[PDB]
């Protein structure tokens, strides 16, 4: 006549969002200590003027202007060059 | 954390300096067995090494 279940899911679950990616893009002014990429790994390597926290977070060290170096795929660098 | 705590325990590292100051971290008892001996700063002087008080 009717049915009695009984099944469910073992799924559903997921994890709260991890707002990643670059926050500071090609040709952008930058204050000292402004963050420029959140990333899982070495996706973007620090160049001149940019350091890297343990989160592999890239944060700029001395003001200036942001510049993206794509060195042919899998090896890429972000840097600051000050204006003048 | 919780009571049962067989491996790893919150131990407090109290100074020899007799200042009053101490620290806290965790030791496994599988590998420390006897005691814990560490060399950290003391802010009531400067840098005087502590032992693993209960």
């Amino acid at each position: 006549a009717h049915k009695k279940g009984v099944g469910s899911s073992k799924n559903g679950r997921d994890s709260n969002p991890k707002y990643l990616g670059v926050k500071k893009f090609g040709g952008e002014v930058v204050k000292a200590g402004n963050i420029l990429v959140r990333q899982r790994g070495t996706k973007f390597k620090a160049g001149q003027g940019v350091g890297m926290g343990r989160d592999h977070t890239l944060f700029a060290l001395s003001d200036g202007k942001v510049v993206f170096i794509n060195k042919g795929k899998g090896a890429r660098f972000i840097s600051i060059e000050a204006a003048q | 954390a919780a009571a049962g705590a067989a491996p790893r325990i919150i131990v407090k590292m109290e100074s020899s300096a007799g200042t009053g100051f101490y620290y806290t971290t965790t030791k496994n008892r599988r590998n420390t067995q006897a005691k814990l001996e560490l060399k950290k700063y003391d802010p009531v002087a400067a840098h005087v090494v502590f032992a693993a008080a209960a």
Binding site: - | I10, T24, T25, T26
Partner: protein, 65 residues
Amino acid sequence: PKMKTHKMAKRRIKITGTGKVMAFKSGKRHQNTGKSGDEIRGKGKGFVLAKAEWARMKLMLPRGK
């Protein structure tokens, strides 16, 4: 009826010269062996509420103290 002062807010909130509202950062009572030492340091402290939370506190203590 004279509006009473919200006695909870006595020990946890501060009025400022200009007219903003302050409190102490939180998580400092058994979340310790965490730690990190810079957290523990950063927490014992004090700080200003974001903003939306201002009106209420102001209404909590009419005398400012």
